[PDB]
Amino acid sequence: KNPKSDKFKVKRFHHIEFWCGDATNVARRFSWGLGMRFSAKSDLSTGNMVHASYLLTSGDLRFLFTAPYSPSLSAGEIKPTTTASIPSFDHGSCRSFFSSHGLGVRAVAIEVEDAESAFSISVANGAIPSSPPIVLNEAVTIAEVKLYGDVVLRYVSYKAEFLPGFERVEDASSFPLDYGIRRLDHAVGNVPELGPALTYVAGFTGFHQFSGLNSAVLASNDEMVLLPINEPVHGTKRKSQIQTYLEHNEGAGLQHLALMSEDIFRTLREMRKRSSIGGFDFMPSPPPTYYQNLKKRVGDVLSDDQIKECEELGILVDRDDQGTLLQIFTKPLGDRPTIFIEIIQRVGCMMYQSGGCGGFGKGNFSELFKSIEEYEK
Amino acid sequence: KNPKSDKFKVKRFHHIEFWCGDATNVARRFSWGLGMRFSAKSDLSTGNMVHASYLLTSGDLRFLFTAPYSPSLSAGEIKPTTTASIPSFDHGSCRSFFSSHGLGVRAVAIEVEDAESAFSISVANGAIPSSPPIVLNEAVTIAEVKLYGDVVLRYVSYKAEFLPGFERVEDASSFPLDYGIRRLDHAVGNVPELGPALTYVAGFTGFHQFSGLNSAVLASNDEMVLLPINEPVHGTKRKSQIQTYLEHNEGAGLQHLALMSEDIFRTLREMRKRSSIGGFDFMPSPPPTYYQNLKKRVGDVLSDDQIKECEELGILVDRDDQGTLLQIFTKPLGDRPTIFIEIIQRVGCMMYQSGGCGGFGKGNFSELFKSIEEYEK
Ligand SMILES: Cn1c(=O)n(-c2ccc(Cl)cc2)c(=O)c2cc([N+](=O)[O-])c(C(=O)C3=C(O)CCCC3=O)cc21
Ligand SMILES: Cn1c(=O)n(-c2ccc(Cl)cc2)c(=O)c2cc([N+](=O)[O-])c(C(=O)C3=C(O)CCCC3=O)cc21
Ligand SMILES: [Co+2]
Ligand SMILES: [Co+2]
């Protein structure tokens, strides 16, 4: 069922913004590890005395990395005269965010028809406002409301290239890395209580509903903006990792970003080649039992060679009633066991491919729990 | 002249510690960009609930990267019961350092005969104490005094492997990168006033003295611990970059680290291959005039091919009366135009090679100023 109740016209995931202490180092690391090009910058060299922001790009995927300069550089400025290209930025909020959370996502940004309207309707409908609609160079409108913890849902809309005040990067420094990642599939929040988070967020967007945890997935009208939310289940055999997140994150925040690849096998080869030379590490590979059992559930979907490749790469495969999902999880992206990344590719549900095709891996909890057990053997 | 007045027995540069907001991302970036192995860690996986610290290594060069976890993780601890492997660490000092300076060096560490003695004698001789001598597992003694700004000079001594509480890293994650860098040659501070900084530091160590700026170089008995210090010259034609450092750094701090390579040509090839894929950028290359003029000053030292290689790589060459110096400078290592790195190799002064052989590049100010001018042509 899909009531299509979006209170305003939502288009797609536009970009994800990380709040860092040093944007250069994180961005350069992410670029290498994930195969993302350097596309745009806003910093001293572009006249921004407030924050340093570097945009990484792979297909439609836009990762933004932002860190504050010294407040001294812009002490003579006020908001009317600001040189920051993202007017919602605030030294104190940024430093406080990073001190409280470490490296993490500050904004999940979606493109909408009209960001001023989407903010008004949102706030009229329960959203806690975070930064009011501001119009940049009469060309783009940006607005922010609280999503969960210190993560904001950021609305962006264009009259008619990322943002005003950004510049396209020197082609010399923009080496065309690409490991196959194409767009953001979903962005997942961890909260201490699912119900109120859902009710709050579903309340002001109109989005509809699509082991260690309980979770639920909110989705826009065409189900291409997918916002799962997790909560822990306490008392369990092995401690809830949603709880471990909340402890080390100092509260709710973004847990993981799921990035769609147009060739999950090439992506995972390319990322794993780089795991130990600056890139990202992947979760431990499941035992061969998980892959012996793969034939009986997806043998009609992937060849034995395609299945053998999965085993080389530690890829996970799950299937619902509409499609098949290939997925894998990185280890945490930073010092803390908090945010991580998921690499995704979906097969099926073509009419284009509809969102969520294959689910989010629900069946892999049972398949792993079992295959762990039948591997002791 | 070398009076050899060290007030205590200094051995060599032991390690450099960066204070970061996220140690993983900086370290992984530095590893790739500079060809440094992952050698040791102290973090949650080793039971450290206080800070995350990762050691990178290339030859004798030891870069340490440290970031704080949430103070909540260790709220029940006191200094006697601490789980931090570096007992001088302090969340508040670290967060304050990084908020004030961004990514930068917190400690310049030298190995000494006896760190307890070196601290006492230092403090008896004017040093502002920063962390008193602490003995770790009855095996290593560490102590800290203020060097300049918020940079500490850290004494380390061993009775008899980096530090207690660190673990050697999984050989799977320890890929043996190596671009030829072998040790730290000198670590340079920028201060607003040279005289008092010199007098202070020479005062408590016994170290002796070895455009935009004035500078002077302090050195231990065998001149293998070299600590230049810069100050600006105001009013000049083009603004002092020592001043630009002080403005963007919020005061004095470490300006650059000069790393010795056993093959500056292979290092610079390897680092430049990686400049645009996660590594480090290098300063703009000098005009061909600088290389046409190279033959007449170092043509007795490097072949025409060796000189041609220099031109490919942007290498700078200078010469004093004892030896020849090959050097190049990176662009800043982080968001701010503050700390950068210098790649060095020295030819001459063999008896072993004596420290400082070839100087620090003094002659290259004139040679560049000129070659810029004779290139307009
Ligand atoms: C597939 N999968 C998985 O297999 N394991 C796993 C690993 C090892 C062992 Cl032994 C057993 C199970 C996970 O732990 C796991 C955790 C998460 N998560 O925390 O969100 C997700 C996930 O992506 C997700 C949700 O579950 C519901 C909300 C939508 C959503 O996106 C998927 C997971
Ligand atoms: C060699 N050299 C250089 O050529 N230029 C340069 C670049 C481009 C143009 Cl056009 C003209 C000149 C520098 O700016 C420069 C700056 C520094 N520094 O700031 O310390 C150093 C340096 O390493 C150093 C000192 O100078 C004295 C204390 C010991 C020490 O280590 C060397 C430099
Ligand atoms: Co997921
Ligand atoms: Co130097």
From Swiss-Prot, chains A, B:
Domain VOC, residue spans: 12-158, 183-331
One family name in Pfam for this protein: Glyoxalase
Location of the protein in the cell: Cytoplasm
One GO BP: L-phenylalanine catabolic process
GO cellular component: cytoplasm
Catalysed reaction equations from the record: 3-(4-hydroxyphenyl)pyruvate + O2 = homogentisate + CO2
GO molecular function annotations of the record: 4-hydroxyphenylpyruvate dioxygenase activity; identical protein binding; iron ion binding
Name of the protein: 4-hydroxyphenylpyruvate dioxygenase
Organism classification: Eukaryota, Viridiplantae, Streptophyta, Embryophyta, Tracheophyta
